[PDB]
Amino acid sequence: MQGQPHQDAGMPEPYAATADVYDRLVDYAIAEWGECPRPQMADFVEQAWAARGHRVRRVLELCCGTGLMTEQLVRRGYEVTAVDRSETMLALAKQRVGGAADFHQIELPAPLPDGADAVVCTAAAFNYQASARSLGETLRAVATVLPAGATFVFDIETAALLKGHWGNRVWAADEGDLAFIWDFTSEPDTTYCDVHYTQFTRHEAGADAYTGVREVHRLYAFDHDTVRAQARAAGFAQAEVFDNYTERPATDTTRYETWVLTRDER
């Protein structure tokens, strides 16, 4: 996976070993750090479409993961195409949604399936973009399949958090059947934070045996000037930034920034 630490043989790529705990860790993130529940994310994007008079029918979802946002869009009656680089994540998305969405294994940046009325990318997937250059190339791929005036909504963890909050701190929990640790490290003059994730899964209740699994996730911070510059060059001169899928403009307490990009029109 481009942009992730070079590591030994048999070391998992992000989500290659942890896909089967992802939904549980999302429930934890919602309860602990303020990650937005998917129904609210879907309410927000629908409100954004309605406020522009967009008769959105076809939605392209990037980095769909296990399909938590995909299922909201499918339930609401959209014709959903959903893409992700991870075969383990996609297998869970297919279990959740079945044939009600069209799934593709694609590593961004790469050409995207044509025909959408709107594009979404939820839950900080864009923090895996390896560079401002790659981010711009991914935004170009989106612009290619969106008509003038159409919208792309995505969220990222705010740049300071990957350097000054989580920054170099540690979080963990012991839930008995599973214990997990996130150890964040960010070197002085880099734009990224390495998250060393470790988990221990109990073999059986009432016994003390566990299996340990580790994954390293490199997360890149993008400041507002970089997002705006790459968006403009990609064909989204208009970009706005909100606080975590609410209509409140982003402020200094925002942890998850929701960017609403509008495709250039005439």
Ligand X SMILES: Nc1ncnc2c1ncn2[C@@H]1O[C@H](CSCC[C@H](N)C(=O)O)[C@@H](O)[C@H]1O
89 binds ligand X (CB under 6 A): yes
How are strands ordered across the β-sheet holding 101-105? 101-105, 79-84, 58-62, 118-121, 151-157, 256-262, 238-243
- Nearest approach in angstroms of CB 215 to ligand X is 11
How many residues touch ligand X (CB under 6 A)?
17
From 41-49, 91-99, 100-108, 211-219, give the range in contact with its own copies by CB under 8 A: 211-219
Strand 79-84, strand 151-157: pairing: unpaired
* Closer residue to ligand X (CB): 108 or 250: 108
Lookup result for tokens 């008769």 = 55
240 binds its own copies (CB under 8 A): no
Q: Find the helix packing angle between 132-145 and 224-233, rounded to 10°.
A: 40
* Closer residue to ligand X (CB): 86 or 186: 86
User: Exposed, middle or buried by CB within 10 Å (0-12, 13-18, 19+), for 189?
Assistant: exposed
Q: Which amino acid is at 181?
A: I
155 touches, from its own copies, ligand X, none (C-beta below 5 to 8 Å by class):
none
- Residues 140-199, interacting with its own copies (CB under 8 A): 170-174, 179, 181, 183, 196, 198
- Nearest approach in angstroms of CB 202 to its own copies is 7
Kindly report the backbone phi and psi dihedral angles of residue 249, in degrees, each rounded to the nearest multiple of 5, phi listed first.
-60, 145
Which residues form the interface with its own copies (CB under 8 A)?
A: 170-174, 179, 181, 183, 196, 198, 200, 202, 208-214
